[PDB]
Design a protein that fits this description.
- Helix content is about 25%, strand content about 25%.
- The chain is α/β, with parallel strands linked by helices.
- It folds into two domains: about 375 residues, Spore Coat Polysaccharide Biosynthesis Protein SpsA, Chain A, CATH 3.90.550; about 110 residues, UDP N-Acetylglucosamine Acyltransferase, domain 1 (3 Solenoid), CATH 2.160.10.10.
- Strands 5-4-1-9-13-10-16 form a seven-stranded mixed sheet. Strands 19, 20, 22, 24 and 25 form a five-stranded parallel sheet that branches. The protein has a three-stranded antiparallel sheet with strand order 7-15-14.
- Its EC number is 2.7.7.9.
- It is an enzyme of class 2 (transferase).
- One of its GO terms (molecular function) is UTP:glucose-1-phosphate uridylyltransferase activity.
């Protein structure tokens, strides 16, 4: 292949940096995609909605544990807490009982390791920012995971060069060369597995399934009914979806498309229906109302994914050691802060877009309890309160006094969008949200201890003079509290 100057520049750059070869291949294919003039637009005229899907709620048969012997739990760990004000890994935040997201996942994985299947395997998707503290945590708390952290557990996220918007050459930023590179999105997960040979290794040792999910999603646990469904229906790529509410109309959605498939020798077939998803970066302007129709496109991707590993390897070998996924062009600058830095593209992919890559792929509607991503301080307030409980298999559930509705946490942005300011609010105790519909807090406040919140409450410190510490031993049902 003959490639352009900018592509050869990207190649030499990535080679000089010892970027592994699968990442170079995938990236260069994307690069040719950008240069050719691919818009990356998924218009309504080329998609159909999904009328109905099977509901996990309506599944009963659990697989044998021998299936669980051929299963890998992969947990997305690359995220920092940068939303909630932390340059630390988000999975190392306390969520309950002094245990963190990683605590809960490892206790689940070893509970299944000791009660169901010894050979259940565990893996983390690490970035460079999360690797060190993760390794330290597992070294301190879970020695058996630290023993194999390098060889078996940690698979590393690769990074791709930002390319300049005008010439598509690799951007250059002398004042900090680090800004010349970015992560390729979660959809990177397949180029790493392949590119490290780790997918080949798992498949060789006889592993069949992998359950991918985000590390901050505490409700994304192993469900044996899902595995069973995958055996019964012979599925290769299952995506868990949730019913889209009007709070989710901003975010993406799942959809249906048709694709002419030809059988090359002898010529017998026609069009096939395959599942895809689109985000707003793939939706044109003129169609943004069709995008935000809750009832037209009813389902969104939870990022809980089940993949059949050898089929993944097979289709990755059909496409030259690569899984080519729809390209999202991120318009940025090299220094994301410096508005006068060279404008650039950050090419990303979503790991759910791989659903279109498989001949037998389906989606399964699941309860929203399996999509509870902690992204706001309000979240881990709801999770730290007794509203949730830990079962003996170390999963978190809602308590039954909630009746399926978790409490609504309406924290003020001024004082509680950061962690270091969130500590103060709950430094004394965490109030009892077991039978609370809504907690609103608009001013500087901190709770006492043994506080019980019932029904709908709203706490105000309008004056803002000083922390309105709430009286200890309090019990507020339907009650407002000002000074």
């Amino acid at each position: 292949k003959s490639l352009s100057a900018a592509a050869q520049a990207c190649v030499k750059k990535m080679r000089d940096a010892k970027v592994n070869e699968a990442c170079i291949r995938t990236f260069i294919a994307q690069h040719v995609m950008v240069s050719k003039g691919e818009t990356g637009s998924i218009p309504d005229s080329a998609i159909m909605p999904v009328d109905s899907l099977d509901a996990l709620d309506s599944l009963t048969i659990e697989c044998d544990n021998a299936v669980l012997q051929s299963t890998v739990v992969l947990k997305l760990n690359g995220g920092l807490g940068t939303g909630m004000g932390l340059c630390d890994a988000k999975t190392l935040l306390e969520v309950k009982d002094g245990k963190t997201f990683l605590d809960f996942t490892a206790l689940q994985v070893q509970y299944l390791r000791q009660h169901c299947s010894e050979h259940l395997r565990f893996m983390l998707m690490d970035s460079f920012n999360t690797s060190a503290s993760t390794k330290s945590f597992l070294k301190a708390r879970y020695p058996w995971l630290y023993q194999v952290f390098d060889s078996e557990v940690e698979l590393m996220q690769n990074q791709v060069p930002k390319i300049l918007q005008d010439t598509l050459e690799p951007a250059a930023w002398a004042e900090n060369p680090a800004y010349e590179w970015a992560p390729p999105g979660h959809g990177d997960i397949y180029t790493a597995l392949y590119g490290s040979g780790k997918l080949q290794e798992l498949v060789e040792q006889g592993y069949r399934y992998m359950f991918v999910s985000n590390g901050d999603n505490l409700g994304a646990t192993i469900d044996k009914r899902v595995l069973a469904y995958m055996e019964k229906e012979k599925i290769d790529f299952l995506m868990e979806v949730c019913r889209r509410t009007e709070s989710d109309k901003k975010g993406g959605h799942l959809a249906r498309q048709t694709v002419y498939v030809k059988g090359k020798d002898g010529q017998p077939d026609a069009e096939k229906r395959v599942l895809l998803l689109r985000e707003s970066a793939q939706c044109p302007k003129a169609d943004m109302e069709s995008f935000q129709d809750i009832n037209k496109y009813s389902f969104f991707n939870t990022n809980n994914l089940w993949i059949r590993l050898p089929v993944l390897l097979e289709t990755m070998q059909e496409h030259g050691g690569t899984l080519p996924l729809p390209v999202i062009r991120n318009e940025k600058t090299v220094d994301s802060s410096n508005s006068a830095s060279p404008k650039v593209y950050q090419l990303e992919t979503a790991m759910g877009a791989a659903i279109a890559m498989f001949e037998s792929a389906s989606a399964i509607v699941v309860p929203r309890s399996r999509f509870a991503p902690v992204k706001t301080c309000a979240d881990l307030l709801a999770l730290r309160s007794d509203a949730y409980v830990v079962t003996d298999d170390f999963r978190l559930w809602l308590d039954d006094r909630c009746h399926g509705h978790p409490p609504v946490v309406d924290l003020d942005s001024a004082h509680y969008k950061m962690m270091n300011g969130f500590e103060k609010l709950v430094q004394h105790g965490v109030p009892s949200l077991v039978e609370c519909k809504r907690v609103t807090v608009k001013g500087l406040v901190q709770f006492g201890a043994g506080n019980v919140l019932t029904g709908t409450v709203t706490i105000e410190n309008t004056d803002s003079a000083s922390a309105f510490v709430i009286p200890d031993g309090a019990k507020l049902n339907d009650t407002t509290a000002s000074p």
